Structure 1
Amino acid sequence: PDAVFGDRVRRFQEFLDTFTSYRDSVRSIQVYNSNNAANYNILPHRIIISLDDLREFDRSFWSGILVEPAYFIPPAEKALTDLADSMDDVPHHPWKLSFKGSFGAHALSPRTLTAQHLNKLVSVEGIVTKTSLVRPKLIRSVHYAAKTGRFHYRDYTDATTTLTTRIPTPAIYPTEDTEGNKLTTEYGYSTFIDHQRITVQEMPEMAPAGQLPRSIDVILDDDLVDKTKPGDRVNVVGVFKSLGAGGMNQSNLIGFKTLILGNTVYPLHA
């Protein structure tokens, strides 16, 4: 990595004192992970950040997030975890963000999208309409050989990662190290997360004259699984990613499906 990450992590270390109330709530998560171990021998790792001190610290970083979020969230991702280690050193894992938001000018209802609002933080609302099912998903695989001792490792991430894009690894089955070995896939020690795609359309009360509704489909991951029933009035915040190939890879009409990689799915009652 560059200095482009380098100064960028350092400025998110000045975000622990001006609004140090966020540094209080990290310990409260570390409280319930100890006192549950005191009864046996629940809380997620998601920190609600108001998008309100960022106007009062740096206007060139607050307007940075709402324009190109694939370059400022993964820096602020790793900056939070090292502060989530140095304060809490007793026990021996993403630590995601939320963005409460103080909702900006990207407050667009799902009828007005897709044109210049790619790669931004939209705040879409509406009525949920499909509610698909839950399946697990592989992230890390730890192999183990018992003829030479040591464990092993394999990262594996899909195109629906946290925010960015990298070289896609179609890792079916990592086996057969540089020896004569029959490697073993340790379950339990590996990691798995949940995955659920729901589709949301616009509200029929704020609709225009008689037409068909236009829906948009949002991916939820790592925390918000089984949060809303179908047929609820839901406000969602995410990043308007757009993945897939538009028929240019298969050497041969329509193309480029769009998704939202949601964070805060926040039920409303109005």
Structure 2
Amino acid sequence: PDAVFGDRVRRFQEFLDTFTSYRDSVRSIQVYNSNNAANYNILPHRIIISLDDLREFDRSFWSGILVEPAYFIPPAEKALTDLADSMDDVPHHPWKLSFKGSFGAHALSPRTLTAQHLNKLVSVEGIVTKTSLVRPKLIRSVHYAAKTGRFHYRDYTDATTTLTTRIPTPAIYPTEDTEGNKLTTEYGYSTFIDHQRITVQEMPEMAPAGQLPRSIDVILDDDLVDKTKPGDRVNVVGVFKSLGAGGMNQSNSNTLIGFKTLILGNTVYPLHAARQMLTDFDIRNINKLSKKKDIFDILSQSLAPSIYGHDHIKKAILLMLMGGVEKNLENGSHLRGDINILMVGDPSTAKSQLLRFVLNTASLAIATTGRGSSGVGLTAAVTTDRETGERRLEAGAMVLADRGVVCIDEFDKMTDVDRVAIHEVMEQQTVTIAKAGIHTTLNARCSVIAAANPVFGQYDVNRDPHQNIALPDSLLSRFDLLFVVTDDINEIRDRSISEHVLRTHRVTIPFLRKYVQYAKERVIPQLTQEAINVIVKNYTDLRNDDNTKKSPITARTLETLIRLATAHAKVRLSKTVNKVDAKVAANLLRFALL
């Protein structure tokens, strides 16, 4: 080699200053991993090269990485790995790259493919909805002649080295090397690696309205597997790559593409438009405003900046969204610790308004639109044969709902077959199915939010308040709060409405999403004899007043009456169940029932 190797070596003296700040980093990450492994009685080989250390002072070496990314990366690895041993060889796995930074206009939205940069560096974002299997793969197996005690060596190359199209080895395992010895193979010293494909859709808001979402796929490696839950705003970066013989491997080859698009990439990141690290400053201010004894009320009014009133509804949403705990019974069935509120109202009274903006601040809680095909909580045994001999129970809609919220619409405008499914997932946290395959109890922590409409217009007052939708009481008994939104007409009421819609055709949100997601990590009190003494008195008088009046209540309603106040103390961020929480819990039900 002298021409193709010279600017390697000139870089081999160049980039060693481009890890003046990382040559500490790459050895500090292993010296304790070498230490703790010797005193057990763990991290991969990630070497994040920024742009900044390779753009401030190298230009010929720079643009080679963004024009021809095929003669440069295995140079960068081979010159990396000697520094692993030249730093660390006394105690007795190739350290590939990641390359974070910016890029300067390669945010190819994959609705667009490129004519300029094929076989180059690409930055891609979107959502994944495939999540295929996991399967290991060999790279190097070592053979051993059991007679004469001598060893052997063999490496298999594949379409996995990411860059060099070597002569493949169309072989699985050889036998009988040039001797009369029956070949033995040591599998502890044979190395493996995994292999997982995933398809990425289009972020369906920035693709303009002329098409359905498109998709491509990406092969990643072990370092960031099981990181990709289906429904994450992911952002990957890798090389663009074609493989496969198009036009010769079969004869006459008419109308068959033979150039599959692939991405053999690295370093995914979740984004947000779970990881939000805050400093000492904002963590102290949120304690400083915690000292105020009004902030439960301020958060109610600072949520929906368009609509008047409904402060009973507005406190309920933030009470539900933050969530109440479920303490599992030891060697016993745990109870309902989910909360599940419901609405109904005569039309155009903002029943669906506030239902869509809970999805923006959802904190990884992606909901459906309530279109009630069978698949709302199940699998329907969709396997697609998974490359000839693998059957997979593909996750329909509960792998996204776990420790999150959902919302569905149009209950009475549904068939029967969804209603039997919402029976099971409410009485029990899990679904278990055996369609043409395996019985499997997979767990789910869900919390529905409902929206239906009454049937006969404005007939609520002149008839019974109950049966007003007459969907089965299997769900009404499994739900707690049936807010009936009024629309009464008062000349000061509507006049106030008329300007407030008009004033908006022309205490903050990201602080709000931090406060709740910090409050999911604080301890749960549950324990004060004072607060439990007053609520049962508060129950008994309405236990005299439920049956001689509107609506009969049951024992599970008491498990609400702990749970609302339990979450109400989670707003307080304290470990003492106070007295003041028990007054808002009683008063909220009093409007919900009267």
Q: TM-score range by the shorter chain?
A: over 0.9
Corresponding residue of 1:229: 229
How far does residue 59 in structure 1 lie from its aligned partner after superposition? 0.6
List gaps (5 residues or longer) in structure 2: 273-594
- Judge conservation of contact 1:46–1:97 (CA < 8 Å) in 2: yes
- Contact kept? 1:9, 1:76, Cα under 8 Å: no
Paired residue for 1:177?
A: 177
- Identity in percent: 99
Q: 1:172 to 1:66 in 2, by over 3 A?
A: same
Q: Using a 3 Å threshold, how does the CA distance of structure 1 residues 223 and 77 change in structure 2: closer, same or farther?
A: same
Deviates more, 1:94-103 or 1:130-139: 94-103
- Distance change >3 Å, CA 135–CA 28, structure 1 → 2: same
Give the 3 Å change call, closer, same or farther, for CA 42–197 of structure 1 in structure 2: same
Distance in 1, Cα, partners of 2:266 & 2:5: 23
CA distance, structure 2, for counterparts of residue 18 and residue 247 of structure 1 = 45
- 169-178 or 38-47, larger mean C-alpha shift: 38-47
Q: Alpha carbons of 1:12 and 1:266: their partners in 2 closer, same or farther (altered >3 Å)?
A: farther
CA contact (8 A) 1:30 1:88 kept: no
Could you tell which deviates more after superposition, 170-179 or 132-141? 170-179
Query: CA-to-partner distance for each residue in 1:143-169, whole Å, 9 max, x for gaps?
Result: 111211121110101123232211111
SS at match of 1:22: coil
CA distance in 1 between counterparts of 2:255 and 2:144 reads 45
Going from structure 1 to structure 2, the CA distance change for 1:209 and 1:252 (only over 3 Å counts) comes to closer
Instruction: Give yes or no for contact 2:130–2:230 (8 Å, CA) kept in 1.
Output: yes
Displacement after TM superposition at 1:213 (Å): 1.1
C-alpha distance 93-6 of structure 1, shift in aligned 2 (>3 A): farther
Deviation at 1:41, TM superposition (A): 7.3
Paired with 1:19 and 1:25, the residues of 2 have a C-alpha distance of 9
2:267 maps to which of 254, 257, 264: 264
Indicate the larger mover: 8-17 or 85-94: 8-17
Counterpart Cα distance in 1 of 2:181 and 2:19: 53
What residue is the counterpart of 1:166 in the other structure? Answer: 166
Following the alignment from structure 2 to structure 1, what is the Cα–Cα distance between the partners of residues 244 and 231?
Answer: 29
Instruction: Give me the whole-angstrom Cα distance separating, in 2, the residues matched to 1:18 and 1:70.
Output: 21
Give me the TM-score of the superposition, normalised by structure 2.
0.44
More helix by share: 2
- How far apart are residue 181 of structure 1 and its match? 1.3
Q: With CA pairs under 8 Å and 6+ residues apart, which has the higher RCO, 1 or 2?
A: 1
Name the CA shift for 1:252/1:260 in 2 (closer, same or farther; >3 Å). closer
**Max Rg structure:** 2
In 1, Cα distance between the equivalents of 2:243 and 2:256? 16
1:3 CA displacement? 4.1
Judged with a 3 Å threshold, the aligned counterparts in structure 2 of structure 1 residues 18 and 101 are, in CA distance, closer, same or farther, namely closer
Q: Is contact 1:202-1:213 (8 Å) kept? A: yes
User: 2:201 touches 2:214 (CA, 8 Å); kept in 1?
Assistant: yes
Distance change (3 Å), C-alpha of 1:8 and 1:236: same
Distance 2:108 2:174 in 1: 44
Q: State the SS of the aligned residue for 1:30.
A: helix
8 Å CA contact retained: 1:52, 1:102: no
Q: What is the alpha-carbon distance in structure 1 between the residues aligned to residue 26 and residue 12 of structure 2?
A: 16
How far residue 188 of structure 1 moved from its aligned partner, in angstroms, is 1.3
| Structure 1 or 2: more strand by fraction | 1
CA RMSD of aligned residues (A): 1.8
What is the CA-CA distance between 1:43 and the residue it aligns to?
0.8
- Distance in 1, Cα, partners of 2:107 & 2:44: 27
Alpha-carbon displacement from aligned partner over 1:61-90 (angstroms, at most 9, x marks no partner): 111101111111111110100111101122
Per mean C-alpha deviation after superposition, the further-off stretch among 97-106 and 187-196 is 97-106
| In structure 1, distance between residues paired with 2:24 and 2:16 | 10
CA distance in structure 2 between the partners assigned to 1:13 and 1:227 by the alignment: 36
Question: How many Å apart are 1:230 and its aligned residue?
Answer: 0.6
Name the counterpart of 2:337: none
Gaps of 5+ in 1: none
Query: In 1, distance between residues paired with 2:27 and 2:91?
Result: 13
1:106 CA displacement: 1.4
108-117 vs 187-196, greater mean Cα deviation:
108-117
Give the Cα–Cα distance (whole angstroms) in 2 for the partners of residues 54 and 134 of structure 1. Answer: 35
Distance 1:252 1:131, change over 3 A: closer
User: 1:26-76: CA deviations, max 9, x gaps?
Assistant: 111222322222323711112000011211221111111011111111111
CA contact (8 A) 2:238 2:265 kept: yes
| Aligned equivalents of 1:50, 1:65: Cα separation in 2 | 13
Please list the CA deviations of residues 181-229 of structure 1 after superposition, one character each: whole Å capped at 9, or x if unmatched.
Answer: 1111211110001111111011011121141211110000131111110
Aligned residues of 2:11 and 2:61 also touching (Cα < 8 A): no
Distance 1:40 1:3, change over 3 A: farther
- Aligned partners of 2:146 and 2:182 also within 8 Å: no
> For 1:232-251, what per-residue CA distance to the aligned partner results, in whole angstroms no more than 9, with x for missing partners?
11000000001111132219
CA drift at 1:129: 1.7
3-state SS of 1:193 partner: strand
- Give the aligned length: 269
> For residues 130 and 98 of structure 1, what CA distance do their matches in structure 2 show?
24
Contact 1:129 1:230 in 2 (8 A): yes
Corresponding position of 1:255: 258
- 1:14 and 1:34 map into 2 onto residues whose CA distance is 30
CA contact (8 A) 1:124 1:236 kept: yes
C-alpha offsets along residues 111-147 of structure 1, whole Å, 9 cap, x if unaligned?
1114232111100000012000100000001011121
SS of the residue 1:174 aligns to: coil
**Is the 1:154–1:174 contact (alpha carbons within 8 Å) kept by the matching residues of 2?**
no
> Matches of 1:41 and 1:143 in 2, distance apart?
34
